C-alpha cells in the first residue's frame, strides 16, 4: 500500500525481521493479476519460519512481468532485476495504470537499456555513466556511440495492457519471522490432549491453587514431571 514506487533499475529493498507474518492478507486478495511462488506454497506459508524476508518493489511494463522469474532473459532480467535460478519466494504483480500513467505521459519511471554484461541475482545497478558503445571513449559526453544507459517508459492511459505500468513486489524467503499459528478455546474437567507454548501432553486441566510468579510458565513436580502450566492468553494457572 505504498504511495510511490521506485524505478526498476533503482529497485527498493525492505528488510523484514522480528514479526509475525500474516500471509492471508495477500493470497486472499483478488486485486492481484500475477502471483507466482517458487520453492514454497502460498497457503502453506503461515506455517513456515524464516530468518529474513526481503520485499523488493519496482514498476515495469506488463509485457515484462514474465521476466521477473528464475532463468528469464530480456532487457529487464539482464539489466535491471535478476532472480536466481534457485529463487525461494513469491512474485506478486498488479496493474497500476490508474496511478502510474499521466495524460501527457509519465516519465518518472525508468529502466536500464545498456549494459556490457548481465546482472547477477539481486544486483542493483544505479549508474548514470554514459555507455561507451563505440571504439572512442565518451568522457561523460553524449553523442554517437555514447548513450545515456537509461530509457524512460512512456506510461500513458491509452496504452495497451502490455504497455501499462504494473507494480511488482518480490518476496524473498531466507528465525525472527514466523506465521500466525492461531489458537482455540480451552475446556476443563475433561480429558484433553493439549499443546501449550512449547510442551505437549495428555491430561485434564483444572483450576489450580498455586501462585505462579509473573515469569513462570510450566510447573514441575518433585520427580521431574510437568504439574501445572500458565495459559498463554488467560493469566490463569491450570
Amino acid at each position, epitope marked *: 500500500n505504498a504511495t510511490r514506487f521506485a524505478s526498476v533499475y533503482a529497485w527498493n529493498r525492505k528488510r523484514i525481521s522480528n514479526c509475525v507474518a500474516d500471509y492471508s492478507v495477500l493470497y486472499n486478495s483478488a486485486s492481484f493479476s500475477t502471483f507466482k511462488c517458487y520453492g514454497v506454497s502460498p497457503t502453506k506459508l503461515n506455517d513456515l519460519c524464516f530468518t529474513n524476508v526481503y520485499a523488493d518493489s519496482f514498476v515495469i511494463r506488463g509485457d515484462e512481468v514474465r521476466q521477473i522469474a528464475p532463468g528469464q532473459t530480456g532487457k529487464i532480467a*539482464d539489466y535491471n532485476y535478476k532472480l536466481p535460478d534457485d529463487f525461494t519466494g513469491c512474485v506478486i504483480a498488479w496493474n497500476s495504470n490508474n496511478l502510474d500513467s499521466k495524460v501527457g505521459g509519465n516519465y518518472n519511471y525508468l529502466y536500464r537499456l*545498456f549494459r556490457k*554484461s548481465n546482472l547477477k541475482p539481486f544486483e542493483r545497478d544505479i549508474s548514470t555513466e554514459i555507455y561507451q*558503445a563505440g*571504439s572512442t571513449p565518451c568522457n561523460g559526453v553524449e553523442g554517437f*556511440n555514447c548513450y545515456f544507459p537509461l530509457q524512460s517508459y512512456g506510461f500513458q492511459p491509452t496504452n495497451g495492457v*502490455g504497455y501499462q505500468p504494473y507494480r511488482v513486489v518480490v518476496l524473498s524467503f531466507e528465525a525472527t519471522v514466523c506465521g500466525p499459528k492461531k489458537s482455540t478455546n480451552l475446556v476443563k474437567n475433561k480429558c484433553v490432549n493439549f499443546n501449550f507454548n512449547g510442551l505437549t501432553g495428555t491430561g485434564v486441566l483444572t483450576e489450580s491453587n498455586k501462585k505462579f510468579l509473573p515469569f513462570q510458565q510450566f510447573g514441575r513436580d518433585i520427580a521431574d514431571t510437568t504439574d501445572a502450566v500458565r495459559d498463554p492468553q488467560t493469566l490463569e494457572i491450570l
Partner: antibody, heavy 116, light 107 residues
Framework: EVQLLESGGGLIQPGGSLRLSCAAS????????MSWVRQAPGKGLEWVSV???????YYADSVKGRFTISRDNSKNTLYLQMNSLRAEDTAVYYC???????????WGQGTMVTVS | AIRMTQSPSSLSASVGDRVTITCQAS??????LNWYQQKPGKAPKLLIY???NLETGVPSRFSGSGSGTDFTFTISSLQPEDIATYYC?????????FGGGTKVDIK
C-alpha cells in the same frame, strides 16, 4: 567510417552447414544490439536472430535449434552459424546494427546463401 | 507472434503527388514501429523510427504518424529516386515482425 562488411555466402547442399561473417568498423559489436535479417528472392524481410549487448541470444521459430549467432571482440565480427540447412533457408542475409536510438541503425549488404 | 499488415501491396503515382501507405498491427505496439526503404538490389535503409521520428538525413518529404495499432507513412511530394519497396517493422515485442511491403513506381 561506419559500415558493415559481410561474407561467407554461397552454395551448400541441404542439411549442410555454412557460417556467415559480418565484420564491423566504427563501433564495438560486443557492446551493441546486433541482428541478422534474411530476404528470400522476391519476398519480404524476415527477422532471424538477435544478440543483446549483454549477450542474451534470441532466435526465430523457423531457425531455432539450427542457427547460432555469436561475436568476436578481438576481431569485432558478428557470426551466424547455420546448421541443418534447408531449401527454404535460401536468401540474402543482411547483418544489421539494430536501431536502439537516433542514428545507429546500419545494415550490411547481405550475402547470397543458396541451399541446393 | 505479432502480425503486421501493410496496404497497399503496390502503388504508382505521379511525381509530386502525395503518397500514403498504412500498416495495421495485430496487437498494440505502442509507437515502436519503424519504416525502411529498400531500393532495388541494395539493403534496406531506415527512414522513420518510432512511428513519427525522421532519421537524420532523410528528406523532409517523408512523414510518419500513428500509435497503438494503426500507423501511416506519407511522402509529401513523390520524387523519381523514391522508387523502392517500403516495409514496416515492430521491434519492441519479440519476435521482430515485418510488413508485407509496398512497391512504389513513378507515373
Amino acid at each position: 567510417e561506419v559500415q558493415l562488411l559481410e561474407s561467407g555466402g554461397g552454395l551448400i547442399q541441404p542439411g549442410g552447414s555454412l557460417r556467415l561473417s559480418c565484420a564491423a568498423s566504427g563501433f564495438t559489436v560486443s557492446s551493441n544490439y546486433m541482428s541478422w535479417v534474411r530476404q528470400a528472392p522476391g519476398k519480404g524481410l524476415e527477422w532471424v536472430s538477435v544478440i543483446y549487448s549483454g549477450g542474451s541470444t534470441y532466435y526465430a521459430d523457423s531457425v531455432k535449434g539450427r542457427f547460432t549467432i555469436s561475436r568476436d571482440n578481438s576481431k569485432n565480427t558478428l557470426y551466424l552459424q547455420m546448421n541443418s540447412l534447408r531449401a527454404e533457408d535460401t536468401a540474402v542475409y543482411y547483418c544489421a546494427r539494430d536501431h536502439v536510438r537516433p542514428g545507429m541503425n546500419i545494415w550490411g549488404q547481405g550475402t547470397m546463401v543458396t541451399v541446393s | 507472434a505479432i502480425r503486421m499488415t501493410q496496404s497497399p501491396s503496390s502503388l504508382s503515382a505521379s511525381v509530386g503527388d502525395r503518397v500514403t501507405i498504412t500498416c495495421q498491427a495485430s496487437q498494440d505496439i505502442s509507437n515502436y514501429l519503424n519504416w525502411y526503404q529498400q531500393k532495388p538490389g541494395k539493403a534496406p535503409k531506415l527512414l522513420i523510427y518510432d512511428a513519427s521520428n525522421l532519421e537524420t538525413g532523410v528528406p523532409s518529404r517523408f512523414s510518419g504518424s500513428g500509435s497503438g495499432t494503426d500507423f501511416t507513412f506519407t511522402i509529401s511530394s513523390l520524387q523519381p529516386e523514391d522508387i523502392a519497396t517500403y516495409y514496416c517493422q515492430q521491434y519492441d515485442n519479440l519476435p521482430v515482425t515485418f510488413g508485407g511491403g509496398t512497391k512504389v513506381d513513378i507515373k
